[model samples]
Target: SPVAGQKYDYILVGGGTAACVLANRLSADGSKRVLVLEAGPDNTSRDVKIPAAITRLFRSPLDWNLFSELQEQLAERQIYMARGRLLGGSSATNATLYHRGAAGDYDAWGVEGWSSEDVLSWFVQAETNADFGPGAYHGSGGPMRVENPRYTNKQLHTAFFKAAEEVGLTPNSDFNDWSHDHAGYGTFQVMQDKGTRADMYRQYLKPVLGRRNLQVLTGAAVTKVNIDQAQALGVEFSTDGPTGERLSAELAPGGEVIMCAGAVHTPFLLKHSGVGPSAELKEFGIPVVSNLAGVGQNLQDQPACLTAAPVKEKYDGIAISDHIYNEKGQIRKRAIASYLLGGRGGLTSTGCDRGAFVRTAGQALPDLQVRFVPGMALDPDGVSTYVRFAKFQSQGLKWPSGITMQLIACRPQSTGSVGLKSADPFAPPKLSPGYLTDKDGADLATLRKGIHWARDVARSSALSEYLDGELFPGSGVVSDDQIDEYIRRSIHSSNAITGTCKMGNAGDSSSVVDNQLRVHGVEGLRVVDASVVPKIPGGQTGAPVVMIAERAAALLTGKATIGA
Candidate 1:
């Protein structure tokens, strides 16, 4: 059992969300050694801890700062992608929204070991919710703390629920309750302890840092995975420090190397190591170790758009108190002091707290997710309201804000892919999710339901009193052609990129990994990140990724499976 050495029981590439879980679980036995290599920095910033300041990290050094490969369907725009470049990865940077997804999502995977019931146990094992008990589809006595948002958007928070009800959707407070179908709106179940963001670093990794069996090396970018023929052996990496050091770490004879490098980089690493398509590998001069054409093929992401409208009246309420001082709004300094003091005040607000997974067209699960952000989104007293909240400008477009319903298609069929732009390991991967390019028109059609539903919420009597008229694709844009065109022009990423490395049966040539997460045709290697998701769930990807890591940990330790 090597503690601090070149060989370890497991070498986890990418010390992100999933890696954190694996680091803790694999080192728990005290006899095994675990090494976690992170290309980014540690989670030690105030921006990472404060829930509201999450958006401030975008485009900064803390973000990977990736972009799409010319989204042909969306006016040839290269949508900006901000993935976390820290210990917690996206979990540290994402808005504090948590959804376990419908139980049917996992069951739909058709993999024996990853059924809904199977994955749910690991999710429970990862969580230590102080708010809920052993039941109610929640698990207590776990590490990660799950709770309601400490502070939520005040002005139009409940409006989502009212609007959801107005649109014939029910009001559900607990979207995480697996027993219930999540077709309602209320405060999101977030990964937060009070108001402070509780990410993987805070929950799983930090507590285990004292263990000698675990070694965390930040700024250590893994350049390639060294395989012995079809067997996984070790990794070659480099550090970004002044030394500019290149290093190699090997796994023990029976050891494994797990890749938790998220969707964008995980597939990129595989391609770099000659474990991708035969022709593509040859093009880059990378010797082929495996001819898995599925390495970077199943790229998927939820494209989102914010629909705006003018508020009926200047929101003259305390909800406005939670935002701007008066009828106007700016980055309030006091909110920061308030949050720093007690983790409360307006700084705790994530802009959008209440949202719904509406089952449009009677699909097996909810196809459309509508997230409501309270504020005048289009024009705020002649100032572009969206610009006013530019601190967290997701789309970078300024607009007036009555209320912006950020819509995401939960189950997107339009598959995209990531590939090697060059053989240079530091170069960014070629990311083309082919958003809204499903020839069958299913992805766009699904989002159209959300667009119309959001319009209904804006026009509904419940919220009509709050909204004046639609702003983006306004009332005049009624026809299907107009809406389809509008959707193509307005689509942006929901930041839930996943499934670049697919997991399926070993015989399935289209799959990169088997049901156990081991890469097919390769030994001592496994990918346990969002990159392996067969199909996205009905909500965001954060919680599901953690559950996957937990299950992976169980697999590595030979622990008795609970949900099986």
Candidate 2:
């Protein structure tokens, strides 16, 4: 790679959540040229826009389809690890779950310029929290449009909440506006707008692409960030195909480069740029720059399981408009007059409408966050309608069924890491989630409690009528130890990875970036994504990531022009 400066006012890497917002906002002056580079293709399909159809984004066409090779944890299950390589990054293919990290999440940062209250303010000024009622914790005029799940149903919602209360968890109306460090029953705020999926592209990128000063290079895979001593000037990346060619882009007038690539890739980029520990970089046959051993260390993500059961109803949850599935035995095949034509079918159902955050009696804050979906999601790869139906079979689940719980480990103690397998840009990076690696990993303890809570809720008064039976820890499997084992076998990822490039004060060796998102010891560089988060969010990460981008953009612009 030739060492040079291919100039732009600001070169934002990864059209993912953060770069989209940063590129859009920073280019507001109309004179500053902003360049955004993503490692994926452009997303223009309606399948991506439809909220219910979003599960498809993680499979083909849109998915980066990166795998972890294989691992010892998770019963050695080879997860079809999915990351968005397309223009919108993971946002285009994610479950659309929106979240503002727990109240303590940021305040605990203990970083110089980052405080929970202050971060929340930036959050308020960034998105239109139309989901939260008029309050101190919400904003409306901002670009990020967050809302409740689409096509909500009353029965499904009550089944989840009543069960939550039955299990002694508080009923929280808005998890996004969580002023306290607890979980509750309410609709999850999602990243959406006007019945369509609203990625950062919808909220930021596209709106500003028309600006003359903004120059975005889509389909570019960053090889390494070009660094000069302690300063970041530009990035060297691949163009068109992985092996076809390479080019270097530089920072333009008084501006710098910011990386918005997700938690997994950012550090790999750092390592590739010769900014990681010397030993690992040397192993990859690449030159080392800064020798920050923690470059790809402490990789973290939410662990999950797919325990399911059969439901009384035989039609898939997607068939929302069908007359009935249980009128009189057998799968109903009504060729009858186009009944409920306008009402439509399950295609319109937005699956999981109501979810709750629960502290699980004795746990601190909410350790288990449960979501009630219209159908069971059978795999971690992404939600495929047919695949969900088939995989549920393993759990003895006979669908047109539904699942109403999320075994959320609000804070997972199991730390993992992501590093380069080799210097080859085409080679998949090494990812070890360290799932259940910790004897007392937050996921293991909390999921164990979550299993008990969900099982109890499924057996409670409000759910007795709808219950078929337990799917995971079957009625025969009762002991807590057995349940924990079952948890170990099933715990996968909720795709909520964070902390690899933690934001903190200088002393924290693990802190990749500062409270202001400035890469320590490096001038004109910032990180704006889930990577900067020191801890995982309490619930879904999409919204919190958006908030990070929004706030980080404001910080980059300086406090004096914050409101602007």
Candidate 3:
């Protein structure tokens, strides 16, 4: 069977964050050829172009949109699980929130050279922040363009901020940059490049595709990594045309085979190729190659919920865009100013601009490891369609108008895992995220505090003057049983999966890869992306994913650039 092009130096199995960065950095010299295999096709729909329409992407063509079995905690209610299959993989269909977790996130990786400082440096390099310090803890010049919207359609955001102020929480100008100092009332940033969803393919792969050294194949589903005595020989993919004659091809590994397919698939991919724990692989009918015990452990997810409340039937003078940026308003202003000067600061922060890293005992750091977004979306699905706080107050719950706050847990104690049924690549892996199942019960307490935080904000003189009170898990649900049930039933994940192939020192039982993200007992194989995170960063996974891509690229390029 004849293939479309020549062989390459490196063959990245999935075209998510790592694929994008690897494509750009590896081929930057115009020497090494790279091949990216994507299971799904490219998504270039206008619908995906609109920022507000991001919520609708789940279950769409771009999303694998796998559903989970009835969760034991939720009385066996089936949940919609989503992952992107397109060229950008999951990033294309994700909620698109930018999170960089806490400075403590990387230190917990328990691996040298993978500190928060190291990852942050890469995050800066991977992105050109539109509004804040792209030069300090961030980067102003990079392949990926990140920014906060100068305009937000969910016009109700102001109310959330005002509500926070009305309560007593401090806001920050920039969440990503405020690693040491905390502020308040910040804007939302995105991985958007020039108003389009700048996924890895668009931001890194597209511009470099014409290079003779790079090759990208779509509709190429990898069946195995082609192992030869614990070493990855190359990758074998399934390719077919109208004739239905399936063809297989093998490209040599110039450097290594990096798995960036994400938590759900990376372990499965490894297991399918006989790289998992011997017993588990045997159960899956996969011949054991490397007996790595920690292939799919330390799975963690969040208890997802929006603490909602009903507004009074009559409260006037509520304009959606009308907002007050007090206290840390100057930082936000300055950040936005710098961005305009060069697409830098307030314009480049993540939503809920101000956050804090909290110890289990409630010790707080000035920098945000956790975030709180003020807005109104009634359901877990964010049905208000970008309607801001004011609109929620105006249009009511059914309308794109209602009151809800996003309470984020920066560091959670729970863990989960993804298991494969067999060596078959087509079967969905058995996913048991074990969310909020910590022995210390840290996440449960955190969600309670978050709920209380939202309620307190609503009671603020700002919102209290005209607003009604808590609804949904109403004040009636404030009792202990109610809160427990709320935790069990109402909450869902932000879908930030990590650590399936955790990176740490070699021989660490829980670690899948070493400090360099190289899988144990395997040469010329590494994983760079969120999957390598030994622990989830305290916030959204987007910023950290970008950081992983950036750092991995730097290590490959032999540049030890820090803080961008």
Candidate 4:
């Protein structure tokens, strides 16, 4: 009860991407105080810090570890979804590959504060590129330090590059530089400072942790946003302590409460807080404060399928597969020494560092992606599979290594929803991605196109020199029905969930939050996460989400300052 009466200048419901930024900027004033409630711990272990150890964190305590509901079209398969439960949010655990998506994506939002031009400044402001010098499209010194991989699986990557060339695709040096266009096959710039994993919290909050005005409470689950007569009060939450204390606290007058809980939980947080559709809340006998019908609806995520092939046994000049297989003898000791002395080595690589962004035929923009992974097959658990293969290759015993190429359907027409499983805060939300269920069947067709693209890439002379044969859909799988059946069972979530709390104009019936990210019917409350993205961007969701948070910080501070 003593803690329930506390108040602050700002109470960030989720200490995630936006919250980390908010804490850094809001507490800078010194006159104001900020409180960040994170549902997870602040992890800085080797598993989280080392790039190669990235897979070890998944499905562990550091992950939100969510799974989607059964899909109606895909043999009722429930896809595994993951989000970082730590203060940095998904960035702390996601593939270090940075993706800004297409510029048209922001323009498509059709909101005032966010435009391709407007967000470009924010993206520029947040990053200090290690590779590129100052340019109109890139920034120099900023909070987030970005760099290309120090050690890539060169033979494999070269094969990928050559394959793309044979497939008639141009190779671009960088995916982040959208100077002339957004189509290309190339190395991706990542959010990393040399070899360590760089995230929002590492770049923003960690530097400002000494500020007295900034207070961060880990293991604090925000249960509800207290609203009275449409006026925002504060938040009620439970702390994971010895007693599992439940506490309610007030926000300072005119203070703000921002939810950075990502797509799945952001909508669920809204519904559990009685700010969702009235009928839905009423079903659980929960009192309704705001009747935003679009809450938890319009869920969208990239769906992907894979193609794999075994490598020819003896014909090679140190292929990446061969490099790893040979390095097996001294790698572990080398990995440890390199990390402890200075960050750089194979341990620093976020395995699938290289990929290509391609535009399917008859398309004006790029809609599919091909990521090359090492393995004989696609791992069902995702991260573990990648890690396993990396280890197996290191043993030098798993000769005749293989390659697995994943094709991602970047823009999906199909959408889904997240709903209350009886308004229980601790109970996982009912999240159905509505994968491949679009009425026109466009989403499924896109994957078909993507798979074809992967196949053609594999057929390239670069890979063909050492390539063995198709493994998954084997050479015999030709008919559309046969491919479709394989896709239905093999399809999985891209972990880039968005649009659960659609941001739009008030006149639009489907939007839950306005362009400013404020909940339409509630005051002093806003959402800043993947949940606010109305349209799924063309590439990865990492960079775009950080850009959103940066813009949000600028909007709140009024100065729109760049960097920490």
Can you tell me which runs of candidate 3 are displaced by over 4 Å? 1-6, 152-156, 182-185, 240-247, 313-361, 364-375, 380-400, 557-564
Model 3: per-residue Cα lDDT over 183-225, one tens digit each = 3555557777544566666777777778877777787777778
**lDDT of model 3, residue 502:** 82
**Mind sharing the TM-score for model 4?**
0.93
Candidate ranking (TM-score, best to worst) = 4, 1, 2, 3
For all the candidates, what are their Cα RMSDs to the real structure?
A: 3.6, 4.5, 6.5, 3.0
TM-score versus the correct structure, for each prediction: 0.92, 0.88, 0.84, 0.93
Q: Rank the candidates by lDDT, best first.
A: 1, 4, 2, 3
**Candidate number that wins on TM-score, 2 or 4:** 4
Could you give me the TM-score of model 3 versus the true structure? 0.84
Model with the higher TM-score, candidate 1 or 4: 4
lDDT digits (tens) for residues 177-284 of candidate 4? 766567778887778887898888888999999998888988888887888889778887888643566687788888888888888888898898888889989988
Error of 4 at 250 (Å): 1.1
**Model 4 ranges with Cα > 4 A deviation:** 1-5, 241-243, 315-331, 338-342, 374-384, 387-400, 560-564
List runs of model 2 lying over 4 Å from the truth: 1-6, 131-133, 313-350, 377-398, 402-404, 559-564
Please, what is the whole-model Cα lDDT of each candidate in the order they appear?
0.78, 0.68, 0.63, 0.78
